[PDB]
Amino acid sequence: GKKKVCYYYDGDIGNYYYGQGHPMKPHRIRMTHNLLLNYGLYRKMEIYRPHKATAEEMTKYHSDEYIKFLRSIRPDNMSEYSKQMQRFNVGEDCPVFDGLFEFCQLSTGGSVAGAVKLNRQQTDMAVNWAGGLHHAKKSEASGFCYVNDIVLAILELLKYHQRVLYIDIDIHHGDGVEEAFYTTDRVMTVSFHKYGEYFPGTGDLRDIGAGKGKYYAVNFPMRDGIDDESYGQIFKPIISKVMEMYQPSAVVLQCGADSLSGDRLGCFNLTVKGHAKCVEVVKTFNLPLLMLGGGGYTIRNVARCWTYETAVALDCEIPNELPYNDYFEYFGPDFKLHISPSNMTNQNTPEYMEKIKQRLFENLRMLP
Ligand SMILES: CCC(O)(O)CCCCC[C@H](NC(=O)[C@H]1CC12CCN(C)CC2)c1nc(-c2ccc(F)cc2)[nH]c1C#N
Ligand SMILES: [Ca+2]
Ligand SMILES: [Ca+2]
Ligand SMILES: [Zn+2]
């Protein structure tokens, strides 16, 4: 039936600024919050302000030197860290900005606090829209990500759960999470992403894990223009097969909204309903679930998407007519919650979708 939902948000998150021209806008988290407050979604949800994760909590995965660097660098002292910046990939994609470390602490705090709440059996679902920064590596920032809150939250879930399933619906391959757990069978990573002349360049169908982790990494490579029909054709059958064979006791779902139609960086054609159908599918398995954010670069659509996915988590129907809110003008000319797909061609033929699904099914047959 209906589940208890705990939601993590810090009112300062929207003030962090990556810089002029940078597509990552933390303000979209504040737009999501304001929209869901104006729809009345706060009435059946426990809202918590995450603690600022310590350097010590972050070093459960990241190197001591990398976290010390993140804690020390500032725009005013950047000139003295040119060597470490190159070493840690801090530059155009992952710039130095005022409050960078505090931003990482809040993003991470929400994910780890949600995992603790799930471990204590005090909630069925935990939501942290400020998390899902899937590209960060042990000693390297990458793709707008500095601290991998997902890996840290999974490490927390591993204290009480033998097997944890990670599902990533961001348009980009979840490389940092896949790499962290590549040689273990205690985490199965499943990523659906655009593959081919696209960042980060990894996530080939043939990358299935290594050593004890062989068959525990699943990658579904897609082409431009995937729509609700095509995505729905493979998501439920793949997740159902993974659930059947792997039998996880907890799930982490990265809900990157850059897979929506009209995204500034993405090339997919999903609507908010098509994207949210993934949340509905995962929720049906009745397992402890940590829902996280991620990409999303047309910020009015990110707010619509995550507001609707929070409503899905709560089993609350919300009207298509947007309620008045602090960012109402961003939602014109229609002022509706749901979006229409574009006329872009879907390069993912039905035959291609079935063929990739059959190859993934062959790999899933190799599990014990
Ligand atoms: C939060 C999860 C996520 O949604 O999955 C993250 C997506 C990361 C995309 C990284 C990609 N970077 C590149 O394409 C690398 C190859 C370059 C090109 C851009 N330059 C700035 C660096 C090298 C990229 N960088 C940018 C960018 C644009 C303007 C800026 F002022 C700064 C950066 N755009 C893109 C894309 N696509
Ligand atoms: Ca993905
Ligand atoms: Ca794995
Ligand atoms: Zn992305």
Token pair, residue 148, equals: 């991998």
Range 206-240 burial, b when 16+ CB lie within 10 A, else e: ebbbeeebebbbbbbbbbbbbbbebbbbbbbebbe
140, β-bridge pairs: 137
Q: What is the resolution of this structure in A?
A: 1.7
* Residue 135 annotated in active site: yes
Atom of ligand 1 at shortest range from CA of 134:
2
Elucidation method: X-ray
CA of residue 1 to ligand 4 center, whole Å: 32
Atom of ligand 1 at shortest range from CA of 296:
4
Place of tokens 């840690």: 88
Task: Give the residue from 37, 38, 15 showing the smallest Cα distance to 28.
Answer: 15
Atom of ligand 1 at shortest range from CA of 95:
32
Q: Name 108's Cβ contacts closer than 8 Å, sequence gap at least 6.
A: 53, 57, 58, 131, 147, 149, 152
Task: Give the residue from 223, 173, 235, 237 showing the smallest Cα distance to 349.
Answer: 223
Q: Pick the catalytic residue: 33, 62, 134, 135? A: 135
Token pair, residue 169, equals: 């619906």
CA of residue 357 to ligand 3 center, whole Å: 19
- Indicate the annotated binding residues: 21, 25, 168, 170, 172, 181, 184, 187, 191-192, 216, 258, 264
Which protein residues have their CB within 5 A of the ion that is ligand 3? 181, 187, 213, 216-217
Q: Taking every pair of C-alpha atoms in the chain, what is the biggest distance, in angstroms?
A: 56
Cα–Cα distances in angstroms (integers) from residue 124 to residues 206, 227, 274, 283, in the given order: 34, 30, 23, 10
